[PDB]
Amino acid sequence: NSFSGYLKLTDNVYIKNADIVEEAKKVKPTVVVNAANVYLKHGGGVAGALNKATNNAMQVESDDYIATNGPLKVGGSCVLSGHNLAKHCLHVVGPNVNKGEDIQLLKSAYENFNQHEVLLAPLLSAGIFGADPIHSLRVCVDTVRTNVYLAVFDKNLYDKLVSSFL
């Protein structure tokens, strides 16, 4: 495929220091993963960046989804359009540690990835969701069996994830 410049961590997990928006625009993957919240309000972090790249179409679609179906559950997901970034967007809700949500639900969140053969994704529950990114990467590797291409924006965090990997 057209994923380029990734470091192989395991048989099926790959990582790159890259902006996931820029990577999606270049590769046009079948699935890009959004780091969503249960209301699909794409205000900040990865979600805010992906939605802005779609010129707010992701938010309009999401609002219709919530009006029809109600909120997601922490650990859950839904598949919506990828707009100009991808065929599909898999919106996955990891726990937000700043809200007291149970970190054990991060494993449930990553299990959603197993329904898709290839994904471009961020580290779930990192950044503004408050979890330790080294832990998130460990759960990813121990849970996901399909092909995942992880994009980590912060170069200092990228170097720490690679250098500390077991």
UniProtKB/Swiss-Prot annotation:
Annotated ranges, domain Macro: 1-166
Membrane topology label: Multi-pass membrane protein
Activity regulation as described: Inhibited in vitro by GRL-0617.
Recorded superkingdom: Viruses
Localization, UniProt: Host endoplasmic reticulum membrane
Catalytic activity: Thiol-dependent hydrolysis of ester, thioester, amide, peptide and isopeptide bonds formed by the C-terminal Gly of ubiquitin (a 76-residue protein attached to proteins as an intracellular targeting signal)
Subunit structure: May form homohexamers. Interacts with N protein.
Protein role: Responsible for the cleavages located at the N-terminus of the replicase polyprotein. Participates together with nsp4 in the assembly of virally-induced cytoplasmic double-membrane vesicles necessary for viral replication. Antagonizes innate immune induction of type I interferon by blocking the phosphorylation, dimerization and subsequent nuclear translocation of host IRF3. Also prevents host NF-kappa-B signaling. In addition, PL-PRO possesses a deubiquitinating/deISGylating activity and processes both 'Lys-48'- and 'Lys-63'-linked polyubiquitin chains from cellular substrates.
Protein name (database record): Papain-like protease nsp3
Species the sequence originates in: Severe acute respiratory syndrome coronavirus 2
This protein's encoding gene: rep
Residues of the full protein shown: 1026 to 1191 of 7096
